[PDB]
Write a protein that binds this ligand. Sequence first.
Ligand code: HEM
Ligand code: HEM
Ligand code: HEM
Ligand code: HEM
Lengths: 145, 145, 142, 142
Amino acid sequence: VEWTDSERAIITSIFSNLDYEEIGRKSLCRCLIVYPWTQRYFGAFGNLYNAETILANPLIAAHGTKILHGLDRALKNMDDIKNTYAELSLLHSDKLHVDPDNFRLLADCLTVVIAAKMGSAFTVDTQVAWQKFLSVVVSALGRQY
Amino acid sequence: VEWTDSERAIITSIFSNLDYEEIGRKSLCRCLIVYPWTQRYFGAFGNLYNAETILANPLIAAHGTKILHGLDRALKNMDDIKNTYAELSLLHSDKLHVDPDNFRLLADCLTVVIAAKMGSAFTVDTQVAWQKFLSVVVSALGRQY
Amino acid sequence: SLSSKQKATVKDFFSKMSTRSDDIGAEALSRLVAVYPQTKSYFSHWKDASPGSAPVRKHGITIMGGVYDAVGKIDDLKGGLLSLSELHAFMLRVDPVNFKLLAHCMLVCMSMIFPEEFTPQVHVAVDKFLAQLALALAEKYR
Amino acid sequence: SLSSKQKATVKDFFSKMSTRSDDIGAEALSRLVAVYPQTKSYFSHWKDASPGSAPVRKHGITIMGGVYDAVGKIDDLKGGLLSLSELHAFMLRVDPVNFKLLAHCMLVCMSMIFPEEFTPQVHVAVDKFLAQLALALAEKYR
Ligand code: HEM
Ligand code: HEM
Ligand code: HEM
Ligand code: HEM
């Protein structure tokens, strides 16, 4: 889509309240517990046996940060979101065959971690812009036709 | 997307054998019967009281046809499918409001109509090709980013 | 389907957010309509959408009223919300996908207002509740 | 949820498919594995996913066993499919988004094999059956 110029201000505002070292880990911790079939896709990570294992597992935290760092890249390449994620698309959708609906799940969990942190500062129009940014990335991560 | 030569051969064969009036009528009728919330967008198309009425409704069967010709604009232009459907995409999502997932629901129903008419000639290989075609068509008809 | 533990988690969390019930509902319906702009077509017959606009604020209170009623009948949702399904699924033919979006919204408001309480465990129980409620409403589609 | 007229449509449609059980499942399964390659991960212990493959044919029949069972248990699919849910939803952790990929291919095989008899009406009722069947199997995720 065409960005409005408060859509950008509102997106960088949100991203400016995300410490990826804390948020990355918790967004993924939370997706693995709330949507536990997502655990299968991360066979390498070891024990995901329970919530205590999810939250104590160094490979989950570290990946949370990779994933959240990846999500944050379009902020710097915002009129080229598609080509920014074209390799990640091929990795998730062509190689690992992650169903696209799982992208919505992680991102929904992320927003929920953000809303906890920002409080009402996170307004309804801030969130709309935020969701426009997530729907563009997710759309870029899906199988490209 | 890269079409192979066999895929192109298979897609143009599927169409060649189809009565657009009879595929249209049956597909849309099935969509509205199988997925009755889609009737929300067709209130001005006479009485939609039950399966039989809908199956006997002439302006449904006329709109059916208009979908199968819509699909021809992609048969005829298989490498410019996004841009061919851009005027439509605008029309569907904004002047009519339809969510992305209803385009899948009708594609599922077109596939079932064509599976029935083509009988045994709807091979695995044919289904793979048809499906790729529909995935692209359906991806072009939804919102863009 | 909720385990008995999970139902207790939901009865206990919904009780803890009672005093902020209205504000959660209004935030939720307001965010639904701002964040997912296709949903306004369902409300086009009103004379408003988005926060401040009291019609959205009082329809949000009604939704939460229905939500608090579903909690009270959390052991038979299909049988107990048959009238509301008739209205949403049969009368209005609300597209099923709009329920997952409303639920998400309600989830971010709950987290927004009760961040320390809204743990992954509460999130699971409530998420599951909202889906089950969506599915009780889905009973009269077809 | 399934109405009487739905259950009846399903029961009397399943009657046709008694003989063809081996053939239908295998074909549907072959078609899911080919058209929707995200599904292949769950069968990576098979050396062949073609039709004709020894495991595709053994598992096709097995799938229709489970489908007959489910026709048996149409009144309480949630109670009824607990062992299969535990298998899919918990042990195997099948992404629930896959269920409709199988379900779709069964409806394609039922349309090729029973055109003109596989009406929109029958499609309503069979789709409703398979959608509940997936909900049933989804019980043990979380
Ligand atoms: C907004 C959503 C997502 C973003 C931005 C994202 C981003 C990334 C990034 C940046 C990588 C590193 C790979 C590379 O360097 O190219 C990656 C790997 C991966 N992602 Fe995602 N991802 C997302 C969603 C998902 C989801 C929902 C799943 C599964 C449920 C998934 C499964 C994986 C897997 C399995 C890998 C490889 C992990 C490994 O073995 O090292 N991703 N992702
Ligand atoms: C492959 C999928 C589809 C194709 C190719 C298609 C094609 C078309 C075409 C060509 C028109 C005529 C617009 C014009 O005259 O300029 C149209 C109109 C329309 N379509 Fe679709 N469509 C598709 C899916 C859907 C779905 C899924 C729905 C609803 C659930 C829908 C609802 C409508 C409506 C309401 C109109 C307006 C008709 C009128 O005012 O007479 N379409 N479509
Ligand atoms: C958990 C989810 C939901 C609950 C508990 C809920 C509850 C309610 C309730 C209690 C009413 C008032 C019924 C009455 O008149 O007695 C209602 C009306 C309505 N709901 Fe919902 N609802 C939900 C989701 C949705 C969604 C997702 C939509 C649309 C996107 C929707 C659209 C409407 C509309 C249009 C009305 C009628 C408004 C009017 O009177 O003008 N609802 N809902
Ligand atoms: C209507 C939907 C489905 C039904 C009725 C069904 C039924 C069954 C049945 C009866 C079994 C054997 C049970 C046993 O050994 O105790 C089974 C096994 C299995 N199912 Fe399904 N299933 C369905 C969908 C799916 C889907 C969509 C997938 C994957 C995409 C899947 C993957 C499997 C796997 C991997 C096994 C184990 C196979 C093995 O022994 O190697 N199933 N299913």
